[PDB]
């Protein structure tokens, strides 16, 4: 794991905490710019190209049948195999939380045009949230989406302007989501007692592992790991969750894929005053510490850091400053 500084083009200001990076056919794209889209880039989605440690953001265009989604901070994102991306939740530039679901796919590639289609949700729709996890599970030749955790504002009932922006953890219900038709089912589990946000999620077959996170009510980053198994029979699917010992305690960690059935996670925040400098390796599950990479002094003494997974087993990181300072850790 070798760390490398990155310079950025004229529009470096676009990059903000809670942004997202997505990988389509090796090509990386960027979503969640700061502020509302400008006449230079109406979509707010950018070809994210790093050449010779220099980052250029180039505007991407949407297709004619596309929705023009607002840029979203801390959405729940996952990959679906045509190859596409699922975006649910998140914060808008106006500080509003979205409960809608958007689907991103490559519509045309000329020397890329995107299709962004919003999927309506009926049934047990999840309350609008940010900082939650969403993944796709496959059980008996059927595909189903699993969504857990996060935060939102107080309900319209108890919301008072004096604490207008006050947030709380969602109810720790698991949400199964059928993407073709837009239907949503909510499951209460006995093993999931507390709310959880900013956690890490790993999806293999009919299973999703939930790691770390931050529980706002207790203000603890619990050191627990949850396995969630999903069965998709002809009838209502069945969900079982089990507590697993050996869980790391980390919020806002980033996850990347180094090889099939093996993931590495670079740090997040370990305490309010502490940072997680160490790195972990997960094999599909066993969690083993790895050698900490060569952090520079600036990263070590920064109180805040943020980042996203580029896809090619390489993390793109940022520290506060110049506006922000960026690194690539491979």
């Amino acid at each position: 794991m070798s760390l490398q500084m990155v310079t950025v083009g004229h529009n470096i200001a676009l990059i903000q905490p809670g942004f997202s990076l997505m990988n389509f056919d090796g090509q990386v794209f960027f979503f969640g710019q700061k502020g509302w889209p400008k006449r230079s880039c109406p979509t707010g989605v950018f070809h994210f190209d790093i050449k010779q440690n220099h980052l250029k953001l180039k505007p991407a265009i949407f297709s004619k049948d596309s929705c023009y989604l607002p840029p979203l901070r801390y959405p729940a994102t996952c990959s679906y195999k045509k190859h596409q991306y699922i975006i649910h939740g998140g914060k808008t530039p106006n500080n509003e939380l979205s409960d809608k679901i958007y689907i991103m796919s490559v519509a045309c590639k000329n020397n890329v045009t995107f299709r962004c289609t919003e999927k309506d949700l009926v049934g047990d729709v999840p309350e609008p949230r940010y900082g939650h996890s969403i993944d796709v599970v496959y059980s008996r030749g059927k595909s189903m989406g699993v969504l857990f955790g996060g935060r939102s504002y107080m309900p319209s009932t108890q919301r008072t302007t004096e604490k207008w922006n006050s947030v709380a953890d969602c109810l720790p219900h698991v949400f199964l989501i059928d993407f073709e038709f837009g239907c949503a089912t909510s499951y209460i589990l006995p093993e999931l007692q507390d709310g959880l946000s900013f956690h890490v999620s790993i999806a293999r077959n009919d299973t999703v592992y939930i790691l770390g996170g931050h529980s706002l009510a207790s203000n603890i980053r619990p050191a627990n790991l949850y396995r969630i198994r999903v069965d998709l029979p002809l009838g209502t699917p069945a969900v079982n969750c089990t507590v697993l010992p050996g869980g790391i305690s980390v919020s806002s960690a980033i996850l990347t894929q180094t090889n099939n059935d093996e993931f590495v996670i670079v740090g997040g925040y370990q305490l309010e005053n502490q940072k997680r400098m160490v790195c972990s390796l997960v094999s599909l599950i066993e969690i083993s510490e790895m050698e900490t990479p060569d952090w520079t002094s600036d990263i070590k003494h920064s109180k805040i850091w943020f980042g996203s997974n580029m896809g090619n087993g390489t993390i793109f990181l940022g520290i506060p400053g110049e506006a922000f300072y960026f690194y690539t850790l491979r």
């Binding site: 500080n95 008072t160 004096e162 806002s252």
Partner: protein, 367 residues
């Protein structure tokens, strides 16, 4: 006594989503914004009043003027009929505050108070100096950039909720021993163009949709000078944002932008966008100055000119105005220049440089 939170009041019905406590003074402007390291970084500090509590304190501050205005209109001091308060909302960035950091100031001005006595609305109070800092009452001070949309919306949305809820009620408050009733009309007019375009989801000032009041384009408004109506309104803008975001007729981005007329972001403050006396004189002066330059070179007779010929015309006009009018030439437009240039005497002066007197007639009539 003079600060918010001292006098008691009531809202009938109670304000929606607003606490009813009346002992509330200065409260945190972030309005409970999450500050965990996980969350979005908070680089600002802010303090505000609760909007209604502030209006209460303001009315109690001006009680003496209200009572004496009722007397001055031949009315009874103890009358308690429904007073109507027209309130101006203003927001501006205060530029750099650093001592060696920008600030935003959210404020309200009491513009006038009328009473209903018969089928008449009797003006018992009106602000004499509406553009003085003495009566622009502070409501929210934040250390943040008016261009930082995320922090701006997070800090201001609570205030907009309180105002929207005050739109649906009557405030009862005890003045001079007699309980009185007040209805409020909120008019957001203290927004300069940039802040209006920001908070009403319009594009930046370089756009083709130049007017914040109408759908015209720079090209259209230059071809059709006069005939346009005020057509924008907060609701229309909200709708057009939803149109942009859903793109329901599956258009290209150019066609979509044409449809929603430059509303490409979701509004979050209902404003009354206007103009000020200054900019009228200014626009007119810029056009007249360019007309003077082009009347000296006889462009009405010669269509083509090099840049050198135009700079020599402007230099000629600048030298002549310095000589005969004692107006210094300016390299960038400004208010009092417009004020001093838009006179008939300067038309005479510039006519001293134009050969043809038919164009002397043209310029004299235009001015």
């Amino acid at each position: 006594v003079l600060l918010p939170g001292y006098h008691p009041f009531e809202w009938q019905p109670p304000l929606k989503n607003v606490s009813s406590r009346t002992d509330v003074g200065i409260i945190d402007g972030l309005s409970g914004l999450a500050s965990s390291v996980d969350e979005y970084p908070v680089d600002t500090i802010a303090k505000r009043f609760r909007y209604d509590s502030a209006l209460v304190s303001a009315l109690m501050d001006m009680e003496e003027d209200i009572l004496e205005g009722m007397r001055s209109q031949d009315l009874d001091d103890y009358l308690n009929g429904p007073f109507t308060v027209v309130v101006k909302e203003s927001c501006d960035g205060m530029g750099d505050v650093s001592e060696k950091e920008k600030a935003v100031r959210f404020s309200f001005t009491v513009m006038r108070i009328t009473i209903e006595h018969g089928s008449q609305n009797v003006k018992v109070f009106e602000e004499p100096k509406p553009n003085s800092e003495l009566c622009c009452k502070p409501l929210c001070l934040m250390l943040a950039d008016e261009s930082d949309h995320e922090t701006l919306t997070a800090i201001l949305s609570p205030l907009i909720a309180e105002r929207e809820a005050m739109k649906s009620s009557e405030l009862t408050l005890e003045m001079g021993g007699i309980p009185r009733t007040f209805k409020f009309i909120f008019r957001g007019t203290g927004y300069d163009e940039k802040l209006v375009r920001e908070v009403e989801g319009l594009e930046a000032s370089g756009s083709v949709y130049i007017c914040t009041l109408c759908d015209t384009t720079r090209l259209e408004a230059s071809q059709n000078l006069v005939f346009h109506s005020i057509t924008r309104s907060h609701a229309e803008n909200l709708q057009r944002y939803e149109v942009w975001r859903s793109n329901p007729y599956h258009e290209s981005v150019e066609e979509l932008r044409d449809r929603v007329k430059g509303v490409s972001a979701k509004p979050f403050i209902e404003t009354v966008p206007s103009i000020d006396a200054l900019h009228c004189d200014i626009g007119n002066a810029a056009e007249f100055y360019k007309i003077f330059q082009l009347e000296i070179g006889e462009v009405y007779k010669h269509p083509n000119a090099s840049k050198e010929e135009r700079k020599r015309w402007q230099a000629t006009l600048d030298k002549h105005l310095r000589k005969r009018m004692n107006l210094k030439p300016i390299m960038r437009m400004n208010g009092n220049f417009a004020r001093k240039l838009m006179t008939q005497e300067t038309v005479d002066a510039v006519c001293e440089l134009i050969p043809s007197e038919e164009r002397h007639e043209a310029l004299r009539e235009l001015m």
